[PDB]
Amino acid sequence: MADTCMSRIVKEYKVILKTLASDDPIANPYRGIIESLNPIDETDLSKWEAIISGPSDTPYENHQFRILIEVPSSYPMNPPKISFMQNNILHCNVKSATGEICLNILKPEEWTPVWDLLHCVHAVWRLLREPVCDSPLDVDIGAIIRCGDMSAYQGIVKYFLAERER
Amino acid sequence: KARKSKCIIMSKSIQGLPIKWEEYAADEVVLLVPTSHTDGSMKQAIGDAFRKTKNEHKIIYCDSMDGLWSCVRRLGKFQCILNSRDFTSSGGSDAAVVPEDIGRFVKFVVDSDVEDVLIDTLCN
Numbered sequence: 001m002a003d004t005c006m007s008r009i010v011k012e013y014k015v016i017l018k019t020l021a022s023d024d025p026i027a028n029p030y031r032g033i034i035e036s037l038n039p040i041d042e043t044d045l046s047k048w049e050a051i052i053s054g055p056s057d058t059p060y061e062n063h064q065f066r067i068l069i070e071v072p073s074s075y076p077m078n079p080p081k082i083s084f085m086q087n088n089i090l091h092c093n094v095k096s097a098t099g100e101i102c103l104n105i106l107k108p109e110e111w112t113p114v115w116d117l118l119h120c121v122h123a124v125w126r127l128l129r130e131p132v133c134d135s136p137l138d139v140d141i142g143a144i145i146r147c148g149d150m151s152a153y154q155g156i157v158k159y160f161l162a163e164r165e166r
Numbered sequence: 167k168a169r170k171s172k173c174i175i176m177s178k179s180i181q182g183l184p185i186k187w188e189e190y191a192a193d194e195v196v197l198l199v200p201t202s203h204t205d206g207s208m209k210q211a212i213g214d215a216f217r218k219t220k221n222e223h224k225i226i227y228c229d230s231m232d233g234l235w236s237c238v239r240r241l242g243k244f245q246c247i248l249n250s251r252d253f254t255s256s257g258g259s260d261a262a263v264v265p266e267d268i269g270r271f272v273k274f275v276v277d278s279d280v281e282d283v284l285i286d287t288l289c290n
Binding site: 090138140141143144147148149150151152153155156158159162163 | 196201223224225226227228229230232233234236237239240241
């Protein structure tokens, strides 16, 4: 170890602070992608929270999203556990009821410790603009896409997000 | 006074009903439009009655029936009002328009040909 874990997260925390504090898109490639990324409790460096903005030209446009990051003590040998708030989003690869996320890059097979928290949250963002519905966690939203019913796809998502605010 | 959440499928006959939609736009209803079984867009008045209260997200247009029934499932509303007489080539009723599946996700299903009942349900 937790000594090699802690010095990583401290390095990442510096890099997160520096990059997000810029308003110039050469230093901050996450402008309008990641609004904030901080540790929930300053003293507990193992839990983190991010706010992302939904990608353009998707039904997620113009709605923010809060993400939970759990860093294991064996990080970065193992991936962090990343998930949404419960009943916060509909998506092929998100099980709305729990918040659980299906992201290929967080699977034991394909995890490279080169990746950090920012590439991870970004990979979550990337996922909203492009879902893989061959292996979906929300079979119903999956079958909507898998039928090319884009009218329904954008309708139910925009519906959900709108009622989320009320 | 207190009504159940509904999921109304907006084929020709249901759009044609004389319902004062502004009265219901505020509640937990969802209107699924089967554009596959109605040629034009949905009646302009119905759209306007919902937009007027900022409840335009309560209207879902659907390219495909398979798409429409997936919505029903995911929304999981208490009622599900429809008129199967619109989706059959033979003008009569056929309970085979609603997938055998739907009883799992929805409490009450009204499939009616008669105007009074439809108006009775949507208006409680």
